[PDB]
Amino acid sequence: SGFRKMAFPSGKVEGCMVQVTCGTTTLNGLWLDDVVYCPRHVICTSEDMLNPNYEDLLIRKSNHNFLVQAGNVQLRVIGHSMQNCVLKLKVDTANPKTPKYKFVRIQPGQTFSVLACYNGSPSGVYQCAMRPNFTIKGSFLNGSCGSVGFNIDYDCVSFCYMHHMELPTGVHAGTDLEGNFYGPFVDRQTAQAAGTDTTITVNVLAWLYAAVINGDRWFLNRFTTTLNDFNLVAMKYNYEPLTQDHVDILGPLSAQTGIAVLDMCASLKELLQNGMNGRTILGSALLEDEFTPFDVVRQCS
Amino acid sequence: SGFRKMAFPSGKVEGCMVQVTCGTTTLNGLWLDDVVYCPRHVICTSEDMLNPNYEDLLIRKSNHNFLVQAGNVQLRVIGHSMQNCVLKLKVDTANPKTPKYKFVRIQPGQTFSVLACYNGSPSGVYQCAMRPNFTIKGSFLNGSCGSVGFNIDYDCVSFCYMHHMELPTGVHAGTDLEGNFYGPFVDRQTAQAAGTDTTITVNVLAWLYAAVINGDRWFLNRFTTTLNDFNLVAMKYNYEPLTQDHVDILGPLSAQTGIAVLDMCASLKELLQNGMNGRTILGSALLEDEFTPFDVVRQCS
Numbered sequence: 001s002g003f004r005k006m007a008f009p010s011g012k013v014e015g016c017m018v019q020v021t022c023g024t025t026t027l028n029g030l031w032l033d034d035v036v037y038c039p040r041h042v043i044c045t046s047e048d049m050l051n052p053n054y055e056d057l058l059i060r061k062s063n064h065n066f067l068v069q070a071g072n073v074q075l076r077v078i079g080h081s082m083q084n085c086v087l088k089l090k091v092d093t094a095n096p097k098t099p100k101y102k103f104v105r106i107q108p109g110q111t112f113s114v115l116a117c118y119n120g121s122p123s124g125v126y127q128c129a130m131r132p133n134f135t136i137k138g139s140f141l142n143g144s145c146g147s148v149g150f151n152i153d154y155d156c157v158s159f160c161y162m163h164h165m166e167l168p169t170g171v172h173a174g175t176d177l178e179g180n181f182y183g184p185f186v187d188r189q190t191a192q193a194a195g196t197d198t199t200i201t202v203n204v205l206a207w208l209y210a211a212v213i214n215g216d217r218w219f220l221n222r223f224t225t226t227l228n229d230f231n232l233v234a235m236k237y238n239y240e241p242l243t244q245d246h247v248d249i250l251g252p253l254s255a256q257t258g259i260a261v262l263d264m265c266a267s268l269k270e271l272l273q274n275g276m277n278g279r280t281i282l283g284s285a286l287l288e289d290e291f292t293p294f295d296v297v298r299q300c301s
Numbered sequence: 302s303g304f305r306k307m308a309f310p311s312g313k314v315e316g317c318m319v320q321v322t323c324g325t326t327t328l329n330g331l332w333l334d335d336v337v338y339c340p341r342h343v344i345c346t347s348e349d350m351l352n353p354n355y356e357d358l359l360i361r362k363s364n365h366n367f368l369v370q371a372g373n374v375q376l377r378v379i380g381h382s383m384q385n386c387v388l389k390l391k392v393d394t395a396n397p398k399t400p401k402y403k404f405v406r407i408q409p410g411q412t413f414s415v416l417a418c419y420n421g422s423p424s425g426v427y428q429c430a431m432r433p434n435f436t437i438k439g440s441f442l443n444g445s446c447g448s449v450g451f452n453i454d455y456d457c458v459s460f461c462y463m464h465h466m467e468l469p470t471g472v473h474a475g476t477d478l479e480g481n482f483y484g485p486f487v488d489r490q491t492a493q494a495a496g497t498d499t500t501i502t503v504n505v506l507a508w509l510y511a512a513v514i515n516g517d518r519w520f521l522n523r524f525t526t527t528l529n530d531f532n533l534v535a536m537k538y539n540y541e542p543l544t545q546d547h548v549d550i551l552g553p554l555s556a557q558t559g560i561a562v563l564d565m566c567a568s569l570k571e572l573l574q575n576g577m578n579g580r581t582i583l584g585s586a587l588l589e590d591e592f593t594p595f596d597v598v599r600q601c602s
């Protein structure tokens with residue numbers, strides 16, 4: 001019983017975190033086999049952030065300009081190349097702790113664990129969702145760039161996020177591990193801002209099922225709605241549309257609790273229209289949308 | 302910016318988790334140097350849980366009755382002893398991954414990370430507080446016994462919790478790593494139940510400071526209260542009394558924000574008496590009490 005914001009165990013990623021320094025800029029890199037991945041803005045100078053040309057900046061670098069430190073051992077850089085917004089630093093030593101891994105781009109609405117790192121040293125681990133507007137509501141301070149987000153399936157780490165920047169509202173933007181940004185963001189100084197966000201409906205329903213599995217039932221009712229009628233209400237409250245695929249994905253949770261998806265949707269409609277009347281669900285006074293159906297199944301009975 | 306339920310990186314603990322099997326019962330153990338620690342109820346049988354005498358049950362065991370598996374390697378048990386409610390299984394191999402460690406009993410109101418494990422395999426990591434009533438609101442399923450809670454200071458793991466049981470309300474009870482229970486709980490079948498709980502006032506204030514550091518200011522006001530007058534309000538809302546030591550511990554956060562502790566207390570009084578009027582603080586619609594002042598400083602600017 002119980003339900004927590006639960007991250008994947010971070011050890012397999014800890015053994016990959018290194019420190020990358022160029023000039024006076026230090027940030028984190030990810031060391032897999034004989035390659036270190038890090039944000040390309042490590043090669044930026046103070047008089048470069050407006051309109052930097054990264055191709056020029058990298059042409060002017062040599063391998064010896066990159067100082068890479070794995071704990072107490074300096075790694076010798078023997079090649080450097082750019083891939084989109086990340087840098088690939090080839091080193092003369094393959095990481096003996098390289099896990100089985102994949103580079104996998106996630107969808108908005110999906111969740112992942114973040115290993116926050118500073119100076120190549122892991123500091124904390126937490127669970128994040130990719131928002132519909134392609135930002136993440138992370139917890140990051142200066143120096144955290146290069147920290148990664150990941151999921152773990154059996155023994156295999158699927159890296160999905162590398163941290164690059166903080167937007168003016170305090171949310172975070174980054175790339176996949178091929179260097180391609182999530183969302184309409186760039187690694188330079190502009191007026192860029194997070195666009196409008198929405199609530200991830202399928203996740204809210206998943207979390208209401210978690211609540212029922214954990215004995216929170218007060219929001220249940222005898223009503224069922226239609227998918228069309230539910231989605232009219234979702235639009236009004238800035239919720240994403242619910243699709244039949246979503247209904248299908250909630251099938252296992254529906255069967256375990258005996259509550260049809262469209263029955264649970266009638267509960268969500270009432271919560272949206274009436275509020276909670278001073279009650280809580282799984283310890284929250286708001287409808288939580290950063291747990292996927294998979295997250296609920298993995299964690300709950 | 303941002304503020305998350307952040308756990309310590311779990312790798313140093315992952316390398317200590319093993320599986321302990323006695324008869325048909327499997328649970329988790331903690332392998333440090335040449336000793337494996339696990340809950341003594343692994344030696345219970347179905348016809349024992351009412352009034353078990355653990356001293357008799359252990360006298361009737363041999364080393365070969367304990368099957369200990371570290372990943373894919375079976376460890377040979379060469380000694381067994383009881384210490385309070387844990388078992389110490391001496392094995393013929395010292396764990397090469399033993400971190401620097403301490404066994405440290407925590408106070409109610411303090412926080413720690415939990416590495417939830419099944420069959421000796423780590424499954425997830427989350428952050429917990431020890432409640433004033435000596436329970437924890439964990440996330441645990443059958444098979445999770447022996448999972449541990451810990452903090453990490455520099456390179457040193459301070460183990461503070463081993464999981465033993467789930468109470469009827471779905472909260473969790475366990476021991477320190479010397480086998481001594483937190484709270485008035487026993488490792489046998491009784492009508493035992495969590496006592497009444499309270500809200501951890503100093504942590505709520507710490508979290509209001511986190512909110513101010515992160516730009517949430519709407520709950521601030523021009524008023525200051527006295528410590529005595531605040532505590533009259535705390536009692537009415539089932540909050541713990543605020544002491545001068547608490548005020549002192551909040552000193553750094555008070556200085557960073559420029560908000561006197563007794564000034565922030567006037568905000569908390571108003572939130573308790575009036576509610577939030579549909580607003581949120583750090584993404585929550587309720588006053589969060591599972592972040593210590595240390596947690597806020599560690600995570601925030």
Ligand SMILES: Cc1ccc(NC(=O)c2ccc(CN3CCNCC3)cc2)cc1Nc1nc(-c2cccnc2)cs1
Nearest residue numbers: 024025041044045046049140141142164165166187188
């Ligand atoms: C997207 C991006 C582009 C370029 C840069 N780099 C710079 O602007 C930069 C780089 C170098 C310098 C020169 N030196 C200044 C003194 N320190 C050493 C470097 C000055 C400025 C940083 C970023 N990203 C950043 N992320 C953060 C950040 C803060 C908090 C949480 N998450 C990310 C701050 S700057």
Ligand SMILES: Cc1ccc(NC(=O)c2ccc(CN3CCNCC3)cc2)cc1Nc1nc(-c2cccnc2)cs1
Nearest residue numbers: 325326342345346347350441442443465466467488489
């Ligand atoms: C405190 C305590 C005392 C004794 C026991 N053990 C038993 O009651 C027990 C032990 C052995 C057996 C016999 N066999 C039954 C079939 N499986 C193999 C064992 C039957 C019952 C367990 C516990 N603790 C438990 N924790 C949980 C639990 C569930 C969910 C989350 N966290 C803890 C379930 S039982």
